[PDB]
Structure formats: structure tokens, C-alpha cells
Ligand binder design. Structure first.
Ligand SMILES: [Mg+2]
Lengths: 48, 112, 43, 120
RNA sequence: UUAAGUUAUUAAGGGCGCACGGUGGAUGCCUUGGCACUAGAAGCCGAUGAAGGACGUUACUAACGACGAUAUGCUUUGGG
RNA sequence: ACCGAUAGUGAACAGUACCGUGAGGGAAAGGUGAAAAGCACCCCGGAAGGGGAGUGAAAUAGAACCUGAAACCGUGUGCU
RNA sequence: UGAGUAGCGAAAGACGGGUGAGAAUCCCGUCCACCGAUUGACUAAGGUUUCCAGAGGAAGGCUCGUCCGCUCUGGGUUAGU
RNA sequence: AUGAUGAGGUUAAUAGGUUCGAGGUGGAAGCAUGGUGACAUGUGGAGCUGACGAAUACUAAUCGAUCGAAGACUUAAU
């Protein structure tokens, strides 16, 4: 029910090894405009 | 040279800002702008405004060419906390911390 | 659930309240005690 | 088939509403899981409309809620009339299809994947 | 070339040392306020309406001080 | 051969916030600079914030303003 | 620290148009749904400006917010019965 | 549960709209005839049909990007 001992800095930081986010798909809109998300459509700010 | 910009007392918690900020550290500016437009966290637009501000400082004050610039440093420090309460059952209150952040971006061209 | 403290304008002025405190010796004691402390509200 | 976070009658109700406003506007914006479900509800309506007879006009009235459209030249027609009138004559030679889905980015308030379902 | 053998290289993350930041308000220095006394006066007012208050009063007015429809003050005798 | 802002009055800015039907209980909170000279003007930004320029002996003295410890949170690295 | 964990306080919404730096959450429209011896309409206690208009979005609002019972400015209560 | 596993990504049957079936229900609507009427009969094993079997590119699986090796020494036989 309750923690018996406090958690140290090193154990807390080991537990957060996998707690991250990843970079998205990001294909480039060739005809006009900047990057867009892949398999998506950007009617404005992109020709694709 | 180097140009920097700071955003002080942003009202998002630092643990949440650092998570997006670990995506752009050490990348060239155009790619970092692309990444920040397609990530859907709450702190993406705020970080993007800080990065834009640094890029504009790099060009108006130091006459640097923005075509070849990299994000040299990106980090978030803690600001002062707002302390609040929430009423719980049986007449008790519990604390709530509304945390804030200082956000710093510095860009460089890699020369001297 | 019904709580204690059901407010009432007349009851409040008649039980507490200046004239009631002035009508007895032990009420005048209360008034003098609050004057000596410097309290802003007397009754 | 898929439950859309609703009970049996709430689901059936908002699915008729979604199918009816697509026939009015030809193009609507919604979430992805809802689009993938209304896709197959709209095309059966168009199939009913291409048959044309009275028995099928009455089967289409079980869906297809009840609205008035005000087109140019002050023409007022119902949704059931617009379907059997012009939507059916448009795709009189397709053999299926009739709709396409286009993905957009995530919505701001929640993370929902937004989508445009159109009528080819 | 094939055998038998020995020993290298990775850091997702962690540890120690160092450098540079933030948060926080200890420490030092300071004093507008207090504490304990000495010497010399004095102690208690009120139906000629007290002590204590409420409302008001400034060109612009919320609070405290000052003042009372003669109201952010009036007269007079001295000082400057 | 009394205290120096957790001290000294509860109170250096108050018998007030606030709590209690009531009698009653009762806080926290000092320091820019010698002088406001308290940042004209330009840039990014809806703003907030910031980078330059300028004032100043000093702006990591910019009003959350003397000094600015520790817990705690980060970024970069020499050995592992 | 526990930890990006528990919780976010009874319920039906959908789409089009608008405004905005920014919209699931604000405004307008259509459809759908819920109460209806009442979730409708009056008068008392009690509260004491919360009422209205224009402006605002730091904090409050268990999310968001261009909105607000929140902030700023200016207004509003009329009796011989 | 998520991740993982497996079937596919146009030189394509992956979803699966359309067409045809299996199975389920049990005789649609409209019209005609009989009956005073409730109703009955015919057209006609009719009509409808989620998840199961086939066929068919009509709609969507676009364009792209990233990662990823260069075969060490010593000794003995060859
Ligand atoms: Mg740390």
C-alpha cells in the first residue's frame, strides 16, 4: 500500500529510461510548401 | 557566433517541456522547425516561438546567415511555483503545485 | 443534512447586539473588554 | 462493426445524422473512426437511390432523417428528394465507391485524428 | 585455407570527479521599531453631555492621519 | 559590557487577513541606486517574455531589485 | 519521494456557418435527445451588487477558452392605494 | 491491454463498396379479387438480411525517409 523506503535519484532515473516520445513521420510536400505528416493532406500550406 | 532567446515563467511544468526539448537538441534549424510543427504536445508552439525569436536575433543583431544554423543548446529550468489546494473527502485539503518553466534556446553557426 | 447555523437577521440583533449587551452588567463587561483590546467591531 | 463509445440507440441515432448531413453538404469533417463507419451507411443509401422504385424510396426513409435544402433559384427540396434526384443520376454508372476519406492532423483539444469524408 | 586458443570493440541507461545554470532565502552588514531604567512634572474625565464610535469634509478619492455643514479648516496675539 | 527582522512588543509594513452563533482566538509580511538618471529607439512575438542600443562606478544593482548558503532540478564533459 | 501515478463530482449529442494568433469547449442555424405534481411559473427567509453595457484574458473555472457569477471602466432600483 | 505475432501495400484481392451465393426469418410494398366488416387469397418459398464463401480495382493502402558489413592476433597442420 505505501512505499517502505524512499526512491533514490538513480533508481528514479533508471525507471524513466523508456519514458520518451519519438519523431513523427514527416514526408516533404514536393510541389509547394513545407513538411507534412505522411499519408496526410495539407490543402493549405502545401500543394500536397 | 551564438544567439540566444529566453522565455521566462511559462506556465507549463518542466518535466513536460523537457520531453519535447530532447527532440531538437543538436539539429539544424529548418529540421527543428519541421519537428516542432508536427509534434502534438502542448509545449510545441511555445518552444517554436522561442526558436523563431533566437533565429531572428541571430540575423538582425549579428548578421548571421540563417541557412546554416544548428540548435546548439536547449534546456528548461524551473520557475517559481503557484501553490493551490483541492478539497478532499471528510473536510481535508490536499496541495496542488502549478509549476512554471524558463526556456532557453541558443543557435550557432559553428565558426569563430 | 441540516447543519447548525441557520441565519436570521432579527435573532442575531436581539441575542448579540449593542442594546442587549448594554442591558446587563456582564454585557457591559464584554463591551469594555473589547474596547481595551482595541477590537474594531463591538457586537 | 465498431462501437463508437455510445449505446446501441445513441450510435444508431448519430449515424443517421452523420449520413444525412453528408448528403446535404457533399463534404464534412469528423473523426476517423466515425468516418470509417458512415462510409458504408451512405453507400447503401446511394444504392437504394439508384434502384428508384417506390419500395426502395420507402426503405431509404427509415434512415435519412428529415431536412429542407434551399438551393439557388429558391428551390426547396428534402434530403430524400435530393438523393433520388441528383445523387443517383450522378453515379449512375460507378459500381460502388461514391466516397473517399482524406486524413488531416490531430485536433488541438484532444488528440483526435481529424478527417474529411467527401462524396466522389 | 582449415583447426585450436587468447584477448579487443557497444552505453539504452547508470556511477564518480569537474565546469556552468536555475530554484530558495540561510549568513554578513544595516535600522524606521521595541525592552529595561534614572531625574523632574503630573495622575480622574462627565448632564456646560464623557470614554469610545458612526457618518461625512480636498478639483480629481479607496485607506490612515487631521478637521465637523464655518468640515483636508475660521479669527487673534507672539515667533519665523 | 539591552534586541537587530524565526530576535525585540502579538504588531519596524495589526488586535488587521482569517477562524468561531457567541464569549473568544489570532497571523504572514523590512533593504534598487549617491542621485530615478526607473531602459528613448530597432528587432522576434497577439501578449507575456527576450536580444541589441542607451543610463549608471556596477543592470548575473531592472522593481519577484543589497549579499545570495544548503536541500532539490537540469545541460556539457575526463575516467568507468 | 510515491508519479506523469489516483482522480477530473450522476446524463446525448451531430454537422454547417462565423469570429479569432489560437476553437471538441464562444456565437448563429438545422436536426436529434432529456424533464414536464416539474429540470416549468410565482412569493417568503437568507445572501448583499453577484444585476446591465463596453473592454480584457495574468490568476480563479478540476481540460480549453476568443467565454464567465472572474478583472477594468461606466451605469441601473421611481408608490396616497 | 500496449507493444509483439501474422495477412497485405498498385508488378496489388489487405479492408470491402458493388454483384452472386450459403445460412436466418417466413410470405414485403403496390395493385387486383372475395367479404357488410374485422380480414382472406393471388401476383410470388415473396421481401429483407451483422460478422460466413466467391468474383470484381469503383474507394483507400501516394510520393518518400531512416537504419544497416567490410572478416583482428598467436600457434600447429596444410
Ligand atoms: Mg538533477
Amino acid at each position: 500500500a505505501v512505499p517502505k523506503r524512499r526512491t533514490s535519484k538513480t533508481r528514479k532515473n533508471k525507471r524513466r529510461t523508456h519514458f520518451k516520445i519519438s519523431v513523427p513521420g514527416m514526408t516533404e510536400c514536393p510541389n509547394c510548401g513545407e513538411y507534412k505528416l505522411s499519408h496526410r493532406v495539407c490543402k493549405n500550406c502545401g500543394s500536397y | 557566433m551564438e544567439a540566444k532567446a529566453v522565455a521566462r515563467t511559462i506556465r507549463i511544468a518542466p518535466r513536460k517541456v523537457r520531453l519535447v526539448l530532447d527532440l531538437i537538441r543538436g539539429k539544424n534549424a529548418a529540421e527543428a522547425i519541421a519537428i516542432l510543427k508536427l509534434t502534438n504536445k502542448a509545449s510545441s508552439p511555445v518552444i517554436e516561438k522561442v526558436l523563431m525569436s533566437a533565429l531572428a536575433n541571430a540575423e538582425h543583431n549579428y548578421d548571421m546567415n540563417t541557412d546554416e544554423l544548428v540548435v546548439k543548446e536547449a534546456y528548461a529550468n524551473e520557475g517559481p511555483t503557484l501553490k493551490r489546494f483541492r478539497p478532499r473527502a471528510q473536510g481535508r485539503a490536499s496541495a496542488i503545485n502549478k509549476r512554471t518553466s524558463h526556456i532557453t534556446i541558443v543557435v550557432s553557426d559553428g565558426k569563430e | 443534512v441540516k447543519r447548525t447555523y441557520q441565519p436570521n437577521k432579527r435573532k442575531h440583533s436581539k441575542v448579540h447586539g449593542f442594546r442587549k449587551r448594554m442591558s446587563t452588567k456582564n454585557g457591559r463587561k464584554v463591551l469594555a473588554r473589547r474596547r481595551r483590546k482595541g477590537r474594531k467591531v463591538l457586537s | 462493426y465498431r462501437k463508437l463509445g455510445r449505446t446501441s440507440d445513441q450510435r444508431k441515432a448519430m449515424l443517421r445524422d452523420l449520413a444525412t448531413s453528408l448528403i446535404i453538404s457533399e463534404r464534412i469533417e469528423t473523426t476517423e473512426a466515425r468516418a470509417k463507419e458512415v462510409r458504408s451507411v451512405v453507400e447503401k443509401l446511394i444504392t437504394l437511390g439508384k434502384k428508384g422504385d417506390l419500395a426502395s424510396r420507402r426503405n431509404a426513409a427509415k434512415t435519412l432523417r428529415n431536412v429542407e435544402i434551399l438551393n439557388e433559384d429558391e428551390t426547396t427540396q428534402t434530403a430524400l428528394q435530393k438523393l433520388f434526384g441528383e445523387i443517383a443520376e450522378r453515379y449512375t454508372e460507378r459500381q460502388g465507391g461514391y466516397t473517399r476519406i482524406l486524413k488531416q492532423g490531430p485536433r488541438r483539444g484532444d488528440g483526435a485524428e481529424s478527417v474529411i469524408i467527401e462524396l466522389v
